[model samples]
Target: DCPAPPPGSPDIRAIGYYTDAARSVIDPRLKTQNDAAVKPLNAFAAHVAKFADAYAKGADEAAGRCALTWLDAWARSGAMLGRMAHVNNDQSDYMRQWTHGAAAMAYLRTQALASEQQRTDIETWLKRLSAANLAYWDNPKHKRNNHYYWTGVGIMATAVATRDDTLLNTAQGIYRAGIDAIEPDGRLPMEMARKRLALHYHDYATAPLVLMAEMARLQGEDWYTYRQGALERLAARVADGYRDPSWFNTQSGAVQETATPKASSGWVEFYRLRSPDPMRFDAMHAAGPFQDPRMGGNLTLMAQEGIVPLP
Candidate 1:
């Protein structure tokens, strides 16, 4: 085990300067194109992973727990993107739940000292979310949507962490269905259906699939093609999201002013799993700048501020 520091010692979190600072510098130029209710949801998983790294490395358990709590609250917020019958189609709310589910999976799977009670509750939470995922795919509209791609991500994350065959098969079933709907060229038709820049849309839509395949292989899901060419496709197109002497990319409308401060944080995940190349990792570090204050003075303070324990 990596040694843990003393209680009062300053155990610093993983601060990838290049990536985080770059995001801060680019923050001013971008704008949110949609209402607050419907704005793009990207930060939840990064926060989960961020605090997970921090806690595992002995920075602050309170901080790690706080990040998970915030993620959980947002997942259950129940705000619809638009009126149900409207043509404004979107399902980031579902994505938010899936992300919280992912966070739960990562936590239970990796940290062995977790309380038995805590582990059991998280397992049950993941199962409920998995049921939600199953229902989401049963609908033809959501079945073919960009959100469908991530449904596999949540299921696989849960299955691998818990070593549950029911969850694994459920996830694989969805993955099979999705690839059938995926275009001949591996592009998702739902993302292309939108008139926006197809490349940019793909950046968000496809990450979960890449992550799911990797998880499948890790857990010994024998029949799945975990290393199948998705990362290469993502690398060729999505690497633009990381290309820079600076953190933010100014080429497209994906981010406000192409500002990268926080957006580039996802690159941390990419680096951890796919590319440890110096240039790629360095670019990811330089790209993030959205500084999240770990809830002031220490993470335990979050409860006094009305952030209760994680559900």
Candidate 2:
């Protein structure tokens, strides 16, 4: 297990780099530093996987009990917040950690068997994470950027787990703001400002938006259509760029490799399941298994619920 940060420390720094550093370049010293900060979060992520495994096995008492034992103890002790660390000084990365951790815990509490005490403890942690996100990301400077996209994913995921409609509604507002910030030509100016990483950032930005769209649909709202199919446009633009790097290269002048589909792009699965488009269906298959732990782990397996293997 990763050691917790020193006691009483609330601030952390990500690996150091100039904001405009080339995406292809890695500063080794800073990379190691960032990895140290990420270690504890990765340790928590392992617990999340255990909780998910317990949930998947039809409430097997031993599995659920063992996972819940640690989770309940951790949450009750408030160790999550106390030990929470971030990359560099970026509060948004901190928010992402709490959001992802809270999202996993929230899902487990919803689907797995848990004692009332366990549930209460988990909810306490969730509330604290949500409050922290709201307090920090709601600042005007943080709105309408990729930070908002990630924050919304955490908020919407928590809302789903806890059945909190108000939180869900607020997350939708964030989603709208995110899509509205996109230009008609499918560029995200803020992302584009990243110079060489414009395409990469665009892809990063879409992951949470797709999750938000899926969650919104589950709650009876057409978030895909909420802002004139802005998300759909964004997805198409990304898909196009992934197949051919020239588009992004021409735009950013950064000679990048062509993007390929990966497990992280599992959001495409939702589009495949919901829409009739053949390309989306193919993209879904191309994206492979849904194994992105950040968005709650093996979502295709979890979300499908008793389905046979997907095509």
Candidate 3:
């Protein structure tokens, strides 16, 4: 439903990061126009949540079929609709939609306990989505920034779903790239470049790395301890900054807004699984459900089941 730009209209593209930016501050006409244009994408996100939940429960067989049918339709249209990229020369938006969508779908395929035929049908499109993300982000020139974290999560989760050790290996490599990029101080250079919103971007990027850690842990790897506890340091920095925005304010020159429960903190639940700190668990328990679909929706209940109790 993205609108076609007029013949001579300037390319009114959108920045993929920074959800806190007031839409009113941007070009009003273009902001509303872009919002209307991506109505389908928004609708698809909601449907993915519905479909993932239904499939996870193995109920509403009819709606589950209809949801996959919708998924097929979106995959067919997603690439073109993905053309509105404005950052990282188009890769940012592409990664945003593809990684999140693919990750959600991958959850249904891997963890939802769907039937054999259902899983097979889901794989047909999953392969296409994974291949596209791999072809682009896997390139030596392209793998960097928060996109690296997310594409790794998406690809690795899909690898688990398909039981493809090769893809899983490659996904682990991407995850290591992110791990290596973290500075000794626990800051991600890619995220810090966001200036005033560095904290927001930092938290956004952490969700996927922690999620990838959770995936590796399930497979008998200790990513929580990887790179000498790089992820732990990263998570700790954010938690500390949330209590005192001074550190982030010193870096970005402004106190960035804290992530809402819905936007981030899904990783907190996963981190708790690795090393259960009552304080951290309590913080995350307050921000429970881990409902950010980007990290596989309802993860607090779905992924953290039987592991930790809510406060």
RMSD of each: 11.8, 4.5, 6.5
* Local lDDT at 245 for model 2: 65
Residue range 199-269, candidate 1, lDDT tens digits: 44455555455445555656555333434554444444445543541212223323423434243134234
List, residue by residue over 1-311, the lDDT tens digit for candidate 3: 22221121112254332244321123456556556645444555555555555455644555445555554444444433334456424534553444444434434433444455656655655655566666665467753877767777667777666778987887788788888888888898778766666776777788877777676755677765667678777777777766676877787666676554454576776676665443755564576665655555566665645211111
Per-model TM values vs. the true structure: 0.56, 0.81, 0.76
Which one wins on lDDT? 2
Deviation in Å, model 3, residue 10 alpha carbon: 24
Candidate 2 Cα outliers beyond 4 Å, as residue runs: 1-24, 57-67, 80-88, 91-112, 280-284, 306-311
- The better-scoring model by TM-score among 1 and 2 is 2
Q: Mind giving the per-residue lDDT tens digits that candidate 2 earns over 115-174?
A: 788777766666666666666765676435677677777677667667887887777887
lDDT for residue 92 in candidate 3, whole number 0-100? 41
- Each prediction's Cα lDDT score? 0.44, 0.61, 0.59
Order by lDDT, highest first: 2, 3, 1
Cα RMSD of predicted structure 3:
6.5
Task: In angstroms, give how far residue 250 of model 3 lies from its true place.
Answer: 1.2
The ten-residue window of minimal lDDT in model 2 covers: 1-10
